[PDB]
Design a protein around this ligand. Sequence first.
Ligand SMILES: O=C(c1ccc2c(c1)OCO2)N1CCCCCC1
Lengths: 412, 412
Amino acid sequence: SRRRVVITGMGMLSPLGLDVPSSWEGILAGRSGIAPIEHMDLSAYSTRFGGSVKGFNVEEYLSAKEARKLDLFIQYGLAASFQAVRDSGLEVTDANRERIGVSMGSGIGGLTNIENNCRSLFEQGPRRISPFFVPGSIINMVSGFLSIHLGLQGPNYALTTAQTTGTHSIGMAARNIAYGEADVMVAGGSEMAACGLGLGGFGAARALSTRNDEPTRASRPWDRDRDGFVLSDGSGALVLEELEHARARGARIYAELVGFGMSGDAFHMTAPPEDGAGAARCMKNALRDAGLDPRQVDYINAHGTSTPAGDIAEIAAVKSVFGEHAHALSMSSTKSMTGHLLGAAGAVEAIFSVLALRDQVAPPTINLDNPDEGCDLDLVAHEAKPRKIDVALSNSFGFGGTNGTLVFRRFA
Amino acid sequence: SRRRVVITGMGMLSPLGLDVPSSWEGILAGRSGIAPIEHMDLSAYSTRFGGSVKGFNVEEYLSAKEARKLDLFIQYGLAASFQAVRDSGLEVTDANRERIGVSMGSGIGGLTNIENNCRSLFEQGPRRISPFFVPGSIINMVSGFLSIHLGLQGPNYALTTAQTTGTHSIGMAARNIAYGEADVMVAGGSEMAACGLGLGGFGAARALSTRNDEPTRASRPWDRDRDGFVLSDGSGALVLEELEHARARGARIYAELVGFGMSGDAFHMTAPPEDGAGAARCMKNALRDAGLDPRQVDYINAHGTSTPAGDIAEIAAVKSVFGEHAHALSMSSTKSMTGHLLGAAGAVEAIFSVLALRDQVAPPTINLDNPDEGCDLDLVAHEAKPRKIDVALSNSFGFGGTNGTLVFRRFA
Ligand SMILES: O=C(c1ccc2c(c1)OCO2)N1CCCCCC1
């Protein structure tokens, strides 16, 4: 029968910090992680800025010899996973290693590595493709390499659901534990799509903000002057654990994961429906899963991408699901500060939702100078809002009309 | 408790055929789908052959205009998915669309699209990258496009576990139905990695057979002269359905999906442990999941990739799990004929496992001319073997030591 699932460890790389606490301090201070990209010449690109991880030292985690064969998305996913496992205080033994698994996903995986091996193929030939190219680039190898480093022999998989990846990864890892397939899962996502193909590919869809002359103001969810999402890099990992397992070992419990929803829009390859119908179905699934009155929801970490159609669809979905209570909860987009970490967005935002519960504060939506038509909820404009939060919801939406919602609550 | 899951529809593209019955006819006749790769200068490559899909007409499924937006691996996944849904007779309605979902995956995704967009980027700059580059290349677009075309609003996701993808996709879709999150799922995988990057990538790791003079003899699982896997393309999709739902509409039921196992080796990146300890745990997990004793297994569709280390690990795992029954079961690698479809391998091999149950026949392991040291099981060398089959296992093992097993049983 279905077991309860709690969060006992968290790990992060984001454009605001090389761990959770440093990232969270930036979130609560309303700091932007967005800046002109230094790692490549983007003069031919319509977008030349994003959320870079700054000063990442992979030799805090792995040998340079190993790190050199891994795409950055694997490096970031391992760093976040190592932090989460250490934060959990969990000891991996012969007695429990078969009951600990990992589900770390990515939207795009090792695009930098694929682009560099494509350059080798086209400028030289197949003889110059790295032997390490495939296992160093493909999405399942955060789960793979983490399991080899820590000796995790439980369920070992990866989701790829575009911008919903991190939320689905955490939800489905919780279902694994709920249903008895595991007692512990490391779950979340990682992304590093800031290469020529990533910036040029989102650029070709005209999906990205082009505010090159003011990058910190580019990401402006629900603002009338928003012009698309800001591409960001990083990772979030959470240790999910069966409640009685966590209680038995005296674990510090951050929060309980009480609800998970998935729904497909079945609307459009890339555009969300304006009325937010799929997001509304997804949130209702999640609230019914959690056995909640919708009025119990105090805080929503929105998807909040800073796209014209996405941001307004979310307002419509929240009004539809919550009715008059839509005016009492607080909803914010931390993408205002981090930008859009794509497959890692739902992982870092799940962490921000748990910390909103720990610290009783709604992170701000920075840059919300002029809320657009109908964006008249409490969107925590400009400054963090201390408040009562018993229940926090984290939403993600992605290409393919793929939706996820996570419901977290305080554990006493 | 848990609901029962049955297979009511199947669909396939493989090196043997453009549908299930044509593919299965090749399988039972011992025919190879392997040939020199055409319309591609492989002069500089150490492998010049593989399993191509021959004569695929995407316009049976999509308009030319919608097909131009999608990588071949998405086209192949949609073809298998449309076939499977047609084969099931399912009628999607407003009353059931929220109960019908998709989990179609891929191991490597849109390499061909990436390669073609790399050409444009390097030669002409980012302004020649296609606007549909991202949504036409990412792995979750089979689930995305399928849900949009058929109006499916149930769970919408995509797994990517390298060579285990199709097995895990089907298993976790089966969990969705068993635990009441959906009544119907379309599940499986698709792959088209026959580009420079895929042949070059696996070639650089020396993972591929280089038997260019005799491509049809290259894939020779458990043969002492095997020299690596054969890269192949295609797709498999199954309609998974809750039993009472299938019975109420008078569905034709092929077989029951009774067990699903997952494990991690937590051992090696590529070469599994010689004793197949991980594959043994995974198979035991699948049988415990089905409430079956190892003695009840009749037929195993091996992973059987034709790699020195892989093939021998599976012999050890089977001897370990099955003890004095290990010789009584029949175990064959249909990769001897199809080659290795990577993320679609588990999907097409679940279909061959189902059809072994329907037709009471173990497919051959062709090219098994000289069984290697210790390869003394009933590996169905050379010719199909009619026999009693009540219970059929299908195994997949992938990069990162990620394992999957499905258990299928006759239904009547
Ligand atoms: O250092 C490596 C390694 C080897 C080859 C690789 C790679 C990493 O990434 C892509 O190609 N390993 C392999 C097993 C994982 C634990 C450390 C040892």
